[PDB]
Amino acid sequence: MEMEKEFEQIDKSGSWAAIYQDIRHEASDFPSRVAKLPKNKNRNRYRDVSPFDHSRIKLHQEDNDYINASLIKMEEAQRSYILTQGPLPNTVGHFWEMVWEQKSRGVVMLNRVMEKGSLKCAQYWPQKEEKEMIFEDTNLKLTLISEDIKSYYTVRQLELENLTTQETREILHFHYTTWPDFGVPESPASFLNFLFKVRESGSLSPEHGPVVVHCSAGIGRSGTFCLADTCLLLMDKRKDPSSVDIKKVLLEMRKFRMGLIQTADQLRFSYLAVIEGAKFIMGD
Numbered sequence: 370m371e372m373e374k375e376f377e378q379i380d381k382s383g384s385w386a387a388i389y390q391d392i393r394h395e396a397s398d399f400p401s402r403v404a405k406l407p408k409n410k411n412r413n414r415y416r417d418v419s420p421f422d423h424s425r426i427k428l429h430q431e432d433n434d435y436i437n438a439s440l441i442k443m444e445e446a447q448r449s450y451i452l453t454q455g456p457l458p459n460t461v462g463h464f465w466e467m468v469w470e471q472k473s474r475g476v477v478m479l480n481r482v483m484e485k486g487s488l489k490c491a492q493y494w495p496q497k498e499e500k501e502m503i504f505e506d507t508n509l510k511l512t513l514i515s516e517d518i519k520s521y522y523t524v525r526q527l528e529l530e531n532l533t534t535q536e537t538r539e540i541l542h543f544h545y546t547t548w549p550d551f552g553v554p555e556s557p558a559s560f561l562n563f564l565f566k567v568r569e570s571g572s573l574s575p576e577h578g579p580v581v582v583h584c585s586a587g588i589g590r591s592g593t594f595c596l597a598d599t600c601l602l603l604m605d606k607r608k609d610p611s612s613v614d615i616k617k618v619l620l621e622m623r624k625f626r627m628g629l630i631q632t633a634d635q636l637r638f639s640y641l642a643v644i645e646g647a648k649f650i651m652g653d
Contacts, residue, residue: 371611373644379637389633392616396623399423409435412463414454418586424625426451428463429470436463437587439626440579441595446602449579450595452626454587455480455490462504464493465511468540468581469531475541475572477582479590485550489585494527494542508532514539521547521559524566543567548590553634557642561649564598573598592629596622597642604647615640 370378379385403409404419412435413419419437420426426438437460438453451471456464468476480489494511495502501512514526525542545563547554554560567573572580584590600618604610619639623629630636 372613372615372640376640376644385633385637388616389630389636392619392623392630392636395620396627397620399624401425401627403435404437406435408433411459412457413437414457415586418454418588418628420626426453426467426471428466430466436460436467438467438581439587441622441625443599443621446599446606447575448573448595448599448602451579451581452587452591452595452629453581453583455583455585456493458491461491461493462507462509465504465509465529466507469509469529469538471581472578473540473572473581474577475543475567475570475580477567477572477580477591477594478542478544479548479582479584479594481546484585490583494525503532521545522563522566541570541572543570543572553638557638557645560593561597561642561646564594564646568598586628586631588626588628589631589635592619592622592631593635593639593642596630596639597646600639600643601646601650604643605650610647613643615643 379388399421401419401421403422403425404413414437420439424439426436426440427434428436436453438451441450441452443449482488482490482492495513498513501510503510510530510532512528514528517524523544523546527540527542528537529540530537543566547559571577582591582594596615596619600613600615603613607613619630630639
């Protein structure tokens with residue numbers, strides 16, 4: 370079925386939970402043996418969220434190459450994304466090592482450091498120009514260059530230096546600051562505006578390594594971001610845009626990382642975002 374009318378049919382019939390459970394039943398199951406080794410327990414935020422072995426990002430290190438991060442490679446859309454958890458106190462150095470080694474231009478953050486009175490990720494970037502961060506375990510230096518605070522999101526320019534080679538690179542930090550503590554946003558308008566700002570920066574484009582996207586576990590809000598982006602790109606590429614099946618796209622992405630889209634409310638919100646976004650692209 371098309372999307373917008375499949376949407377009203379699920380709303381009127383109140384069957385979002387049943388659609389979402391079908392997705393959970395059909396989703397791929399692949400091994401995650403490296404994630405579960407004892408030496409990696411303090412490298413995982415949640416015991417039930419792990420990267421598959423076949424798609425995990427490897428650090429270029431001979432001691433321990435493990436990080437909780439996955440490469441989602443979308444062949445028809447010609448887009449790649451790295452989805453990862455919010456860094457932990459003992460993985461902030463690994464996180465920036467990955468950004469460096471994978472040649473990423475942008476980092477997309479969809480959570481606040483504290484939510485619901487608890488810490489959802491480490492304070493992994495500097496908050497003042499004159500107070501830079503040094504990660505001694507991976508030999509990197511990170512400096513805040515500039516910051517632009519808007520009503521729904523903040524964009525930062527960061528400089529990452531590889532202290533071994535003295536090479537430097539500019540990284541863009543796109544921080545969506547207004548996702549509510551409970552539930553999903555009422556309108557997708559600010560999320561779409563945010564997606565378009567990431568796109569306009571070049572961070573999603575083939576002349577760079579894959580964008581790095583995270584929330585707390587790296588599967589819920591993070592899944593909503595890449596699912597919406599990929600669905601809108603396919604609608605631009607194909608002769609028949611109404612052929613894009615958001616459930617099929619989601620199952621394809623779940624071949625590369627488990628658990629993408631965590632609730633039926635996130636599934637409904639993803640539909641809404643693609644539907645509204647397809648009107649603004651045009652023709653408009």
